């Protein structure tokens, strides 16, 4: 078997493989974000840019996690990567919605995979979620709120007008 | 005859002096634009600069097609220029409606004289267009889409204020 | 309908979105193709890093034909992404085997979509391809065939130590 | 009526668009001048340079009244640019003539309006001619004529020695 | 049968493989004009350089297609060089004159592989002639119609004395 | 006859056009050799590498040979250009076999002309090739000879292995 696997569960090794699907998942999701919003019919710059980065931002999660696969002596098996659940996103406030309820996802499968570490006694991967990915996914939850928050305080009764505020004077843009 | 000219149809000669007649109709029109945003009683600097740069730009690809007609052993021709279809360009909205009605009638010259180059074998005139043309064209089209899409969402019930945000927070001023 | 699209058709339209689906499926193979060769039982970096380069290169490529998708007034539709076709790669050779069959697939790709756009009289489509996909591949096809030789002179009665010598002095670590 | 215009005539406003227009005209017959002496039948590079630079000059002459017909709340009206007087300009001498030609009808056409404004008291018009249009014909006449004379002194009996020389020791080439 | 080789007919194959053999004759007529014009007899560094460097530049486009040969699987043939047509070149007239011609005949060259590129569905050959080789061609034939009709304008009745003036105002010397 | 031509015999005038058509026809066969080692099923891009670059030193000592003809009074004759003797060019050590018999032929014909410069008392002749070509020719001979005993010691019964590691650790690249 593995010349350096140690401490490392079969059940770890199938959810980490669940979870960079999971990742790249995410990853596609935010690339269909983004280009829906770079439309000749969207327009909202700003919104895409903040999807395209978080497209990558996702894709890096899964290499990570693959990279810490290799370095337990685990084995990387990629799955079918479903399509986004939408081809269309509405609103900046759709879409920021879907991204929250997206992100949640993803933290509890983060959750999930904690608990399992640490019913099995793998501290290198509790502290490898720890250290990497826990805390990440709380800040970037919490900026989607006040986002979430922001957005919902411009739709009053000019929804138009408050989405481009929005995306001129919160988001970066370029 | 010409020492220089191979290759080069009289049917393409007179079609590129008539698309750089085409071309210098679009730098009058996007002066006299620039200038209406200019007005005391308009008031929109960066429509005003938008516009006026625009003016440049056609004017350079007239500027373009004229060396390539050299270049190539042809005769320019000039022809009287026509004044631009407006006097007064009303809104943003009106003016940005206009501008995209204009660029898709130069685009469209430029795809039949690309057309009319590929019936005549003539690849040198394909690619002069397919480097220096159709991109950029394309690429301007687009961003007139873009703007067009903000400038609509922003009308609402308040258009003064919505025009004024565009300029200021799109429009480059400054 | 759409503001800004002119001269695309249908056809196009939705090649390019098979295209792009063709240059995700590729990266993902690519990224599959890295990890394994990290894998602590394979263990070569100078193939690793090879292959990863070329996942995010293949990415580019797929980014670029969607955002040309946006420019020319086409609508992005993404659809499910095929797992790669093997979880194991075997040797470099085999690897690298692999992967001209896969590039060559994606050049008649580009090649069909390039006479599609030639028989639908597009000429920005045509132009975009040659511009930035048509020589990358016949230069990335090129490199691969060179490689593919060097493996193959290497083999002889000895694998193992052609296949370290080619990834120490052929292929950039570290 | 205008909330700024003061102390400023229709028939001011009216001659300034005139003038423009001349400015414009004037514009166009050198950018035809310039691309006359870029043929490869005729190529003499410093006297296509001298004529795009006079091409330009114009340009931002007429740029100049239009800023100034809309800081005075007068309305810039175009007309239709006839086309130059010639379509070939015969020898450097020839075109010379032409250019001081020209020149001096827009300088009388600017002493014409600098008159109207002096009969209607309007002295800024006055001085903004005298600033910007006056002094600057004066010395590009003198430099037509300095011209002129090189260029008439080297006819001689060996015109093709004479004009290639003047062009390469006085006009500016690269 | 080749490993890379794709969409690459036998046709155009052979062709580039002619197409560098014209290239190279034409370099090795510059080579020979270039030494003639350095001779003690007839000493015009001018030209001298000026030929010199067309010689290196047609090898240039040589090497560039020999380069293109491989990278597209095709497989470089060399054939005899024939020898200029020319052992002497007469006056700098008579030899821009010549080299006008030799011009027209590669750039028809090129024009017929670019037509039987076309006729076989090779945008690939198609690209790399337009973006290395049309438009150069034509500048280089532009710049040669340039000097015919300046070296012509000087001969008049002196041509000693222009064919001097020539070689030390226009051509560069070092 | 000639102004400047002083003790330069015809017999030395056409044996210095003769070995320029040899330089030239090595140079011819250095390029060919380079391109063999370009190809994808060869790929030794040092052995590509070394020949290139003789190409390029046996055409510069053509250049040399024909500055020198123009400089003693002789007239410089071109003749055709002999295709090499291969167009497929085998193993490295076949090709560094064939350039050192290539290399040899040369240096006999240097040593013959400078024997006939003896022998018709031409100093300036003598120097001319002890000075630019003797020196080099001999360390040129000696590196191949070099190179032929480091391939020869690697052939033994894994010649693609040897092949590969000359390439890789004796020859310029990357
Ligand atoms: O030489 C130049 C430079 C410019 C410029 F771009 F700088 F403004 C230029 C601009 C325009 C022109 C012309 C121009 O001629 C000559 C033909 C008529 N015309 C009407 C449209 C605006
Ligand atoms: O935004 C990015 C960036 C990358 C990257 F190139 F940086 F890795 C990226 C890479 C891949 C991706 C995706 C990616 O999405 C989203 C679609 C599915 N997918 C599978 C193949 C590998
Ligand atoms: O490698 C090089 C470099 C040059 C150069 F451009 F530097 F002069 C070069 C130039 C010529 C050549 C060759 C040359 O081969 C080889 C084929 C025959 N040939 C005849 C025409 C002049
Ligand atoms: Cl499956
Ligand atoms: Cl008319
Ligand atoms: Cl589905
Ligand atoms: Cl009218
Ligand atoms: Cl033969
Ligand atoms: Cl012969």
Redesign the pocket.
């Known amino acids: 078997s593995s010349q350096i696997r140690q401490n490392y569960s079969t059940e770890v090794e199938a959810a980490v493989n669940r979870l960079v699907n999971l990742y ?1 998942r995410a ?2 999701t ?2 269909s974000l983004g280009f829906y919003f770079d439309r000749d019919d969207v327009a909202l710059e700003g919104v895409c840019h903040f999807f ?1 980065f978080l ?2 931002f996702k ?1 890096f999660g899964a ?1 990570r996690l693959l990279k810490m696969q290799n370095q337990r002596g685990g084995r990387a098996l990629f799955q079918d ?1 479903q399509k986004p659940s939408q081809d269309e996103w509405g609103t900046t406030l759709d879409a920021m919605k879907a991204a929250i309820v997206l992100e949640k996802s993803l933290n509890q499968a983060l959750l999930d995979l904690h608990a399992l570490g640490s019913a099995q006694a793998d501290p290198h991967l509790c502290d490898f979620l720890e250290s990497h990915f826990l805390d990440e996914e709380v800040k970037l939850i919490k900026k989607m709120g006040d986002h979430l928050t922001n957005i919902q305080r411009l739709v009053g009764s000019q929804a138009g007008l408050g989405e481009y505020l929005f995306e001129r004077l919160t988001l970066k843009h370029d």
Chains 1, 2, 3, 4, 5, 6 share one sequence.
Do not use: C, G, T
Request: glycine fraction near 0%; proline fraction near 0%; hydrophobic fraction near 65%.
């Open positions: 790249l990853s596609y935010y690339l395209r497209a990558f894709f290499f990567l």
